[PDB]
Design a protein around this ligand. Structure first.
Ligand SMILES: Nc1ncnc2c1ncn2[C@@H]1O[C@H](COP(=O)(O)O)[C@@H](O)[C@H]1O
Ligand SMILES: NC(=O)CC[C@H](N)C(=O)O
Length: 529
RNA sequence: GGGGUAUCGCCAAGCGGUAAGGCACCGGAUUCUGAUUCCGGCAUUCCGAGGUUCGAAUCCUCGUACCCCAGCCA
């Protein structure tokens, strides 16, 4: 439960509503990020719980900022998250004729007029946060004139910015949004849905409340910054001939530590090529989280966990990680991979190799087991061998033994280094029958794999607050490695993740994995303490 | 000016009855993954200062802090 569901309840109880109809109206001007997932879960979830309906609407009123790639991606992420919208996908543009009709109603009612103040003049007449605005000298034209003028605008008769339709409200309102808000502006730009049919487009404030009412929305859910706008939302509806009046309720938007959560800043990263694209695994986009190996369900749980309030918040990365870790911990089948390898030769070993049995999930036998190839020339992780080091160190030391994961116990005896004194191979003996603990990979049957270790995009907790958020990017947000995985992974499915034992959860694809060179993305590392 | 929000490090219940929960954190137990699991611990206090009440985080008052608004963006 949350404040919004309590309102909904009271409406249902009072009889003000007998059904609930919500909506997710992003503008198709960028890819969806996790903040939008909060909104999708909120709106689509309320619908299903209250046995109602929730539409997917593309708030497409600004042609110059939108693209068809985005509408396609949005529909894709919404689906991927696991939600279904009510009926067809809607578009604000579906109402362009209705909106133009309604603007004509406001004009006929004397509540709208065509202003000729330049875009600079409008701001100048607008007033300040503390000084009232002032009336345009064109504010009192007749209905007849406004009608003619608006038609002229609509017919491509005015150059851009040369005129616009403004609402006639109160230029001295403390609500700056109510100071004659612009209803229509001229843009000779082709729209991704209406092509070149219109040269005039409606503004957000005029469009949204009307789109909401036409679609029969009962509870319009948005974020805190449209609180002031709710006044214009109501004004518009209160002043036109429309049978319903949806009510807007605002909740705080999501802020995630170490990243930005606004399409504008995410676009800059894509545009400036500091990430591969909107779906880069380091990106907080739904596509990027998906490509990183995150499950729709872990995201759904994150949104459930964070809540919906009016408090400005900033969630910690540990919260999101917790969610994905919980999921993958339960479901990911375990595997063996070595991110940083060094060859270890069991001189004691005789043969061409053998096959040891390995559980697909050390705590869930029902998930079965598999046969993994063992031998005398395996691969271990460099950090798992210490010629020296403290008593706490539970891994391989130059005179100590260690249990090879699901195999035998071995003993390091003679190391071998190179020119720069770096070790090249470790010589050990194995106890013919012995079956800390360390993972390994038989060099002979090993599959060469590229491993991508992801990390926080930015060096600071709140990069969006920085003057130049880009200068504070983390140069180690992506560190690529070349390791070895058990041949098993030869059939790994893109997107699906496994737990690389003692390392973390990894998934294939990355838009890079080929048959020859597989690319594994580390979704999240295990809890190291 | 106006609109909003202030409860444990980060989220978050609580709507007059005397502070849920999650994340994180600190112990301990297990464990062929230093993971998982498993127990135990973690606000005598709710931005502040008064006030009303038998009694408030929950009501009033005066303050303080932070967020949002001056796109022909959404
Ligand atoms: N950062 C955010 N956090 C939560 N919801 C958001 C965020 N940004 C946008 N939305 C929601 O997604 C819709 C499209 O943007 C908005 O109408 C909001 O409901
Ligand atoms: N009122 C709202 O839900 C805002 C919709 C607007 N298109 C947005 O993406 O923020």
């Amino acid at each position: 439960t949350n404040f919004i569901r309590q309102i909904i309840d009271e409406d249902l109880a009072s009889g003000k509503h007998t059904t609930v109809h919500t909506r997710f109206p992003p503008e198709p001007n960028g890819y969806l990020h996790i903040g939008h997932a909060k909104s999708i879960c909120l709106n689509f979830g309320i619908a299903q719980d209250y046995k109602g309906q929730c539409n997917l609407r593309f708030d497409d009123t600004n042609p110059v900022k939108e693209d068809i790639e985005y509408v396609e991606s949005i529909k894709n992420d919404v689906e991927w998250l696991g939600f279904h919208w009510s009926g067809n996908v809607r578009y604000s543009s579906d109402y362009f004729d209705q909106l133009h009709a309604y603007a004509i109603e406001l004009i006929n009612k004397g509540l709208a007029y065509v202003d000729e103040l330049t875009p600079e003049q409008i701001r100048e007449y607008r007033g300040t946060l503390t000084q009232p605005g002032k009336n345009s000298p064109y504010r009192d034209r007749s209905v007849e004139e406004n009608l003619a003028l608006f038609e002229k605008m609509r017919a491509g008769g005015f150059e851009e910015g040369k005129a616009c339709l403004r609402a006639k409200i109160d230029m001295a309102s403390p609500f700056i949004v109510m100071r004659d808000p612009v209803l229509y502006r001229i843009k000779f730009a082709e729209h991704h849905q209406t092509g070149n049919k219109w040269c005039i487009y409606p503004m957000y404030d005029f469009t949204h409340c009307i789109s909401d009412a036409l679609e029969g929305i009962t509870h319009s859910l948005c974020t805190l910054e449209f609180q002031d706008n709710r006044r214009l939302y109501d004004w518009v509806l209160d002043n036109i001939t429309i049978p319903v009046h949806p009510r807007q309720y605002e909740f705080s938007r999501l802020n995630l530590e170490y990243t930005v959560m606004s399409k504008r800043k995410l676009n800059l990263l894509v545009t400036d090529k500091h990430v591969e694209g909107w779906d880069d695994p380091r990106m907080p986009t739904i596509s990027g989280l998906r490509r990183r190996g995150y499950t729709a369900a872990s995201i759904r749980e994150f949104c459930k966990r964070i809540g919906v309030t009016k408090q400005d918040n900033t969630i910690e990365m540990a919260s999101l990680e917790s969610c994905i870790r919980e999921d993958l911990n339960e479901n990911a089948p375990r595997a063996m991979a070595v991110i940083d390898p060094v060859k270890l030769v069991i001189e004691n070993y005789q043969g061409e190799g053998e096959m040891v049995t390995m559980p697909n999930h050390p705590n869930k036998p029902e998930m079965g087991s598999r046969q993994v190839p063992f031998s005398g020339e395996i691969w271990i992780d460099r950090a798992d061998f210490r010629e020296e080091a403290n008593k706490q160190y539970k891994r391989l030391v130059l005179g100590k033994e260690v249990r090879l994961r699901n195999a035998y116990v071995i003993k390091a005896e003679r190391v071998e280094k190179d020119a720069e004194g770096n070790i090249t191979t470790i010589f050990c003996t194995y106890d013919a029958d012995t079956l800390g603990v360390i993972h390994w990979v038989s060099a002979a049957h090993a599959l060469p794999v590229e491993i991508r270790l992801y990390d926080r995009l930015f060096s600071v907790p709140n990069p969006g607050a920085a003057d130049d958020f880009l200068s504070v990017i983390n140069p180690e947000s992506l560190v690529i490695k070349q390791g070895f995985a058990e041949p098993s992974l030869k059939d790994a499915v893109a997107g699906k993740a496994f737990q690389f034992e003692r390392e973390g959860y990894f998934c294939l694809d990355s838009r890079h994995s080929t048959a020859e060179k597989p690319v594994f993305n580390r979704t999240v590392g295990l809890r190291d303490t």
